[PDB]
Design a protein around this ligand. Sequence first.
Ligand code: NA
Ligand code: NI
Ligand code: NI
Lengths: 120, 121
Amino acid sequence: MNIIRKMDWDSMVHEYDLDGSRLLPWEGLNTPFGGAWCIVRPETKSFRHSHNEYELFIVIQGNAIIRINDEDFPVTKGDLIIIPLDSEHHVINNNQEDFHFYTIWWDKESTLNFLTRLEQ
Amino acid sequence: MNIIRKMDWDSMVHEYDLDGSRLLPWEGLNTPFGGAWCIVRPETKSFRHSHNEYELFIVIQGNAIIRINDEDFPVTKGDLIIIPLDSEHHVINNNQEDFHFYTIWWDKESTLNFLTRLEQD
Ligand code: NA
Ligand code: NI
Ligand code: NI
């Protein structure tokens, strides 16, 4: 089982108009949530969407405006954002510096699935 | 409820020899995990402990050493670290700049407690 994953900034995967690195798959790691390290590149904005799976953002570097429903939030390093269920959300980076955040998402399914694997 | 919590660094609570900002409590937030934004100050180390709970570190800023049962894991921005269950873990910051990481921890008690809450909600 692998304790450490060194970040490889050369193998980010573009998805939702951002460049990310997903937590999963990770063999041996049983979690009740999913995650991703996300980079919104300068002068861009991520794809807008909503969903039935709880989510929060941990703001790591840079500055962005985060738009939830029709509202905007200035955000910066250290800020936490909880996205309400059924909310359109996306991230706007107007700065000449990459915007980094980590997202964690979870629901009933992911939590039960964690419990099942500890059973088995 | 609160959609956003702006970080105030001054309000961090010192514990295990680091400065932390715990996620919980957060009214109306139901999670199957806990967590915290942690800073190991320059030229300091955190309090070593072991536990049954699962735990993951997301390394945010700075360079530092995670010692897990005496083997040392050098880490930087972007690295992720799983803490094996019951391991003897702490964080060593030998240089001149703050070391930041986010810890997320979880167990059967926290997941089941999350499920019980939706059902009660
Ligand atoms: Na600093
Ligand atoms: Ni989302
Ligand atoms: Ni721990």
